[PDB]
Amino acid sequence: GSGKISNIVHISNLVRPFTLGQLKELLGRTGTLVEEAFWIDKIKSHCFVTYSTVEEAVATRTALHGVKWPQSNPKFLCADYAEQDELDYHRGLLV
Amino acid sequence: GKISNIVHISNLVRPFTLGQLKELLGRTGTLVEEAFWIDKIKSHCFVTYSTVEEAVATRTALHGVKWPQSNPKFLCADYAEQDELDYHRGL
Between CA A85 and CA A34 the distance in angstroms is: 17
Q: Is A92 left (phi over 0), alpha (psi -120 to 50) or beta?
A: left
> Which value in Å is the resolution of this experimental model?
1.6
Between CA A12 and CA B47 the distance in angstroms is: 20
Angle at A63 between CA B70 and CA B40, to 5 degrees: 50
Dihedral sign, Cα of residue B81, residue B85, residue B88, residue B91: negative
Tell me if B73 and A80 make a contact (CB, 8 A cut-off).
Answer: no
Interface of A with B in 64-83 (CB under 8 A): 66, 75-76, 78, 80, 83
DSSP A16-41: SS--HHHHHHHHTTSS-B-GGG-EE-
Residue A46 has its nearest CB partner, among B1, B39, B73, at B1
The neighbouring-strand residues paired with A81 are: A9
Chain A residues near residue B45 by CB distance under 8 angstroms? none
Tell me if A86 and B1 make a contact (CB, 8 A cut-off).
Answer: yes
Between CA B37 and CA B27 the distance in angstroms is: 18
Chain A residues near residue B87 by CB distance under 8 angstroms? 4
Tell me if A78 and B76 make a contact (CB, 8 A cut-off).
Answer: yes
- Which chain A residue shows the shortest CA-CA distance from B88? A4
Q: Which method was it determined by?
A: X-ray
Chain B residues near residue A91 by CB distance under 8 angstroms? none
Q: Give me the sheet containing B76-79, strands edge to edge.
A: B37-38, B44-48, B6-10, B76-79
Between CA B18 and CA B59 the distance in angstroms is: 18
